[PDB]
Amino acid sequence: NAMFTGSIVALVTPMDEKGNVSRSCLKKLIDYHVANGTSAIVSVGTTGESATLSHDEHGDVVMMTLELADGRIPVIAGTGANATAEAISLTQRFNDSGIVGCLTVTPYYNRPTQEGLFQHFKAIAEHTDLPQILYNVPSRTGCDMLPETVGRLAEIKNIIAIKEATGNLTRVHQIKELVSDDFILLSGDDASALDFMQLGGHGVISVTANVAAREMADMCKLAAEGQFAEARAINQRLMPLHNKLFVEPNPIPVKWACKALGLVATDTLRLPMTPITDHGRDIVKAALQHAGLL
Amino acid sequence: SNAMFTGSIVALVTPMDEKGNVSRSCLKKLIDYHVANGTSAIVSVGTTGESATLSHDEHGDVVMMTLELADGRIPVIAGTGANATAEAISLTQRFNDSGIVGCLTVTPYYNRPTQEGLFQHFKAIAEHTDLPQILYNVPSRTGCDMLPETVGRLAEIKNIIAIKEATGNLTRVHQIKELVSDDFILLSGDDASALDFMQLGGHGVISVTANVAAREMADMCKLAAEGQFAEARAINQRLMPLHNKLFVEPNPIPVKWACKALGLVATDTLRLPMTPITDHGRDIVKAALQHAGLL
Amino acid sequence: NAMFTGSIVALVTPMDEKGNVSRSCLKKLIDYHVANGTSAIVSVGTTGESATLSHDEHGDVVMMTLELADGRIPVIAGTGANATAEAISLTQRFNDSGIVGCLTVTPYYNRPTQEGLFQHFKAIAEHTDLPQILYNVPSRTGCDMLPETVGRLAEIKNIIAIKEATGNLTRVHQIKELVSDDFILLSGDDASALDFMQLGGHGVISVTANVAAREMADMCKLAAEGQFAEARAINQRLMPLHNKLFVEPNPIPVKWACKALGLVATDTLRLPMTPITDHGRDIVKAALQHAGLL
Amino acid sequence: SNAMFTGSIVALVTPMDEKGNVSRSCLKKLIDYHVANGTSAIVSVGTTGESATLSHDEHGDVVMMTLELADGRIPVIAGTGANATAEAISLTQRFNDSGIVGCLTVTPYYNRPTQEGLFQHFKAIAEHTDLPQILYNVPSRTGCDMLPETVGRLAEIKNIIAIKEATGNLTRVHQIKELVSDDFILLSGDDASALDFMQLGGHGVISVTANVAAREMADMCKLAAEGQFAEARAINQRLMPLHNKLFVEPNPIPVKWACKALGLVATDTLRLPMTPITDHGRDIVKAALQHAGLL
Ligand SMILES: [Cl-]
Ligand SMILES: [Cl-]
Ligand SMILES: [Cl-]
Ligand SMILES: [Cl-]
Ligand SMILES: [Cl-]
Ligand SMILES: [Cl-]
Ligand SMILES: [Cl-]
Ligand SMILES: [Cl-]
Ligand SMILES: [Mg+2]
Ligand SMILES: [Mg+2]
Ligand SMILES: [Mg+2]
Ligand SMILES: [Mg+2]
């Protein structure tokens, strides 16, 4: 479970000017994560523009990430969908594929009941052998998967973790009370992730890790070892990035930041995501200098 | 004249058999029901039609099925919402020269674009079709709130003609009206506040309740357009338990059960992740139907 | 009931540099409201710094307002308290006093139940002959008096009106359905007040009326006569004031605006209220020019 | 040393007879209970003590009664909150040279001052006393949220020593700690999250639950201060139904009933606008007391 703990990068999907996926930028990013202690890469999640990649593109990008990784770092596939049949289909695409697990978000827009969530994730789980990381982010989905529901789903053998993005830190022990000792809790909120780990969480699926991979890996290791004062000093250096990478909707700011650091050639996104505004750019650039990255 | 875009427009359920396959015989009944009862237009494969769980192709086939069954007797508006601009375009192109009268297109959900992103999204969609576009704002589902200033910018585009405003924030009526021409159409997307929305100057409602109270909703809208607000309020009071309790569980779980209870559809089957109505919800909806004098 | 409908001013309590109440400024304000068609004056409400006037000062300021009014305009006393015994006592202070009615807010800070609200307002009502205007403003009090509770209280003979400050316009017909035809609904939210009246409300207890009394009186009359297009043209001229009088906490901006228009000598407030900041001042000044008042 | 300002501090009820008069015999029992069971300090005439419905003079008399009954056996902290700065000063001056160890002072409620207003409010209060001041942030009651930056500014004043942070927003712990010296004290004002708050670096809790579980709360706080978080969590799990259900109706309605049920007070009478616990609430609190093994 080393691959499901610590600093896991919510990896950008780098694009050329046309919005086509850039293989050479992907190679650079993956090499960067291997070199700097990132525990694993989430491919085609939220920060990877899952929304504007086709069902097919999803597949290709994950397989490209897998190929470039070449066994040097674990890859987790983003496989969320708001229709259970589509989530199953996305999941089946990666059976026997070399990915180590899947990251699967609560259905968005249609606002299912907690029983609908249970049935959704149960069906997905039953259609694969792969480890499943649940993902709760009500600010994007309009659905809040409550702890009791997480508890029910944790009983399923291949439902192994949750990415809890609410920033509501009381959830850590609410979930822990209901699940086995080996169930994995991951922060989905960079600004509160160190707090989350100090309370008993096991890592973070991180946007900040895109541009501060070594610092994020170090902070998570320090936190795992109970060296909270030391972890906090790193967290303070990164706090402006934890906040300002969301000055405009993720991943607009983090793609610009990758560009500014030389990690990707362009910060192009696909509509409806837009290029960072001047005002946002100046703010991110300042945060990057506060962190000593630029 | 703009009548196909005003009054009571039904957010039509997509009826299914027990395997979750679309039921053509049920859709025939529903459409005949709306023809017979004063419904202005049918939204096909919108939110209440389980757009989320119909494939790209099914979006197409179910809208065409509905048009074929309407047989020119009632206008049909296609739900063409997507959170990727390229997908919204593709969905919209499917209906160019189809007989549908317009498209209902929701703000991108989940990815939370900026207002400029919204502007560019809807501008691109509008530029790839001749069909009239009805914008749709529902932040409680999308995580994105399209502000009145942004609606104003979009309303300058020739084929962006209307907004389905679902927030239930009634201040939006005149905030939008202040920014748009007098022919731009405002539609409620919140049944419980829709009469209020019309009394303030709105032009109609894209309605869930209208699935099971089509004549009543059509009458209420006509009265409100005529300034007959006391008469309209009497209908609204009769319907208010439905306006609320059709959301006791996530739409369209309650309204599909209610269609079944009234004999409009054969089954109330939904596709996962939507679930059959609970006993608790069912008893509540049944009571609201009886309050409305429909059961 | 003319005195409980139309444009009712939430009157500032003007002060000197020391925070003492300025009689001469009060005279000027009251003369202004007589001359410009204001239906009534609320004395020592929220905009009048009820919070930082003593139980005694409350009394004096209301009696001074009454004396300066000299029968030319009705005066309504702010008599809200979060303890029922204190609300009773404040109310009894004005029995046989010449005030036409009282404005009484839901208890703040202690967050009573709806039954606690019912009992609070019932006791107050039973201890006076004066008309009672309920006041709901959950953003300040932490208590939301729901329509059903308003309905129950409207059955009491001297509970005659509600100042509904939520800006939630669905409340108009929710309340109307539950009360007699003669119960009075007043907006407590200037930005939405014209909407509120268009839906069937009878007036507004207004901050904007402090600096645009004639315009507010006209808009309310137009609205009462069903001349909504004409009312709307006035509302558009005033909208920047409806919003920017709250650029900093009311009544910081409106007191500066009274000062800028020559209605009061100083814009001094009592702590914890603070002088308007430069940034707020510029914004209010601009709103006043948009309205053609400055 | 700072011990009177850390650990389990009780937000003590003000016990009343059936006419709503303060009951001295009941307060004696409560205070003896807290002496006997490890409570660090007593907050007298705070939020749970019905500060809102005690007069200015009663604020004074009840705090002095409590000090007299404590008889130097447990420290007493006076609630001195007011939404007018001049009133907070007057309330605070009442205790200069009284034997109380400090004051608990809430952000002004209802009038919604700016952060600078908060700064000036608390600065003026602090300048008119030698007593240590514990700031109190509870936006759900006040309509005002004192931000961490403002707490940092105030913490520079010599006799502003602590904050009771009631938001349950656990990110505030290190946001405040980053801005204040290492001797500034952070106390939870949210029983349900208080252990989490302490695990993150908080120093204690001003607690409602401690009214009916004083020994348990004292033990949990001691364990958390010692880093014994698993042992502390076991107590927290036992108490969590109380931490929640003591707010099933507005505090202090439930906790006064619970004191009565446990024989700590003679009556659970409150002053209007607070009301006797409903049957529904009573059954819920009784069940939580039984879950905690206190009844
Ligand atoms: Cl992700
Ligand atoms: Cl979230
Ligand atoms: Cl729809
Ligand atoms: Cl919404
Ligand atoms: Cl007022
Ligand atoms: Cl409010
Ligand atoms: Cl307290
Ligand atoms: Cl709070
Ligand atoms: Mg730009
Ligand atoms: Mg069932
Ligand atoms: Mg200043
Ligand atoms: Mg009772």
Side-chain angles (χ1 to χ4, degrees), chain B residues 138-140 166-167:
Chain B
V138 58
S140 61
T167 58

Side-chain angles (χ1 to χ4, degrees), chain A residues 46 82 109 111 116 140 249 271-272, chain B residues 47 83 85 110 112 141 250 273:
Chain A
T46 304
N82 64 354
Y109 189 87
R111 304 194 71 196
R140 293 175 178 285
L271 280 173
Chain B
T47 301
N83 66 351
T85 304
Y110 189 86
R112 304 193 69 192
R141 289 176 183 288

